[PDB]
Amino acid sequence: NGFRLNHVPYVSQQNERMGCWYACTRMLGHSISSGPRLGLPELYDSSGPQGLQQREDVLRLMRNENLAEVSLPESRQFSANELGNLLCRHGPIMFGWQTPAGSWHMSVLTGIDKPNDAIIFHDPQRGPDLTMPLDSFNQRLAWRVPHAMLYSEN
Amino acid sequence: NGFRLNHVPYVSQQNERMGCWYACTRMLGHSISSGPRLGLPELYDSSGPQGLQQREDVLRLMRNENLAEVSLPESRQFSANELGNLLCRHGPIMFGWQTPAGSWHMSVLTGIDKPNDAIIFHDPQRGPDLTMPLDSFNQRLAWRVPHAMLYSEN
DSSP, X not given: OOSBOOOOOOOOOOSSTTHHHHHHHHHHTOOOSXXXXXXXXXXXXXXXXXXXXXXXXXXXXXXXXXXXXXXXXXXSOOOHHHHHHHHXXXXXXXXXXXXXXXXXXXXXXXXXETTTTEXXXXXXXXXXXXXXXXXXXXXXXXXXXXXXXXXXXX | OOOBOOOOOOOOOOSOTTHHHHHHHHHTTOOOSOOOSSOHHHHHHOOSHHHHHHHHHHHHHHHHHTEEEOOOOTTSOOOHHHXXXXXXXXXXXEEEEEOTTSXXXXXXXXXXXXXXXXXXXXXXXXXXXEEXXXXXHXXXXXXXXXXXXXXXXX
């Protein structure tokens, strides 16, 4: 088997701005009353002075709420084993990704399905224990920001 | 809390010679018809000739039955998190350890109890899903041999 975490709890979001942020931190085990000041597009895909501000807000929360970021390969591409290895070290990982309407979303990575070359995740909108192709994850992850993948330090 | 594998099958050693070897390897998913030629003390605590031999014998078994060993840390200590990471990658892990009473035994590591700082293991002579303190595991593990902790490559 391998490379699967097994009771990462499931939390579904409230339909409010950043609803996915609160549900995802909860799946990592944190109870955090604050989050990003604007939307996901700003958080995961800003530029210039806006990018710099959003980055400062995120570092703030990361420090205060005991979250850390995954160092991102310059290739813009994880292998199954790389991801599996990170998950087994770090536990569940909250990631920002861009869906097929161009909307950004957050989900929690919980495991790797090596035979079908897929990541296993909880989606705070769509449900627990979904999979998507590893090729889709690499394509859609928020590579532009160093805070694309957050894991708990607690 | 702590990473736990939840269905490793339990196999007892009966009144068989080197019965703990056959039980542990069966708990790991293998059917292996032969085992180390000398006993447990020689497998886990030998040095000089009786030890370079048992090292050769065990590497051969590993090659033949698709088992591999965990690289032991220089510090001679594992953390709760590191053992969890190891179980997450490799599945159940059979370990050699020395009891207070002085004899060597083999057991199967299955999970970690973080809150109580303990390992969870199947003991072929004492039963399933026992725990012992992590401090005990570190004190009593067969650190002298590189094959202290074996896992399945299947």
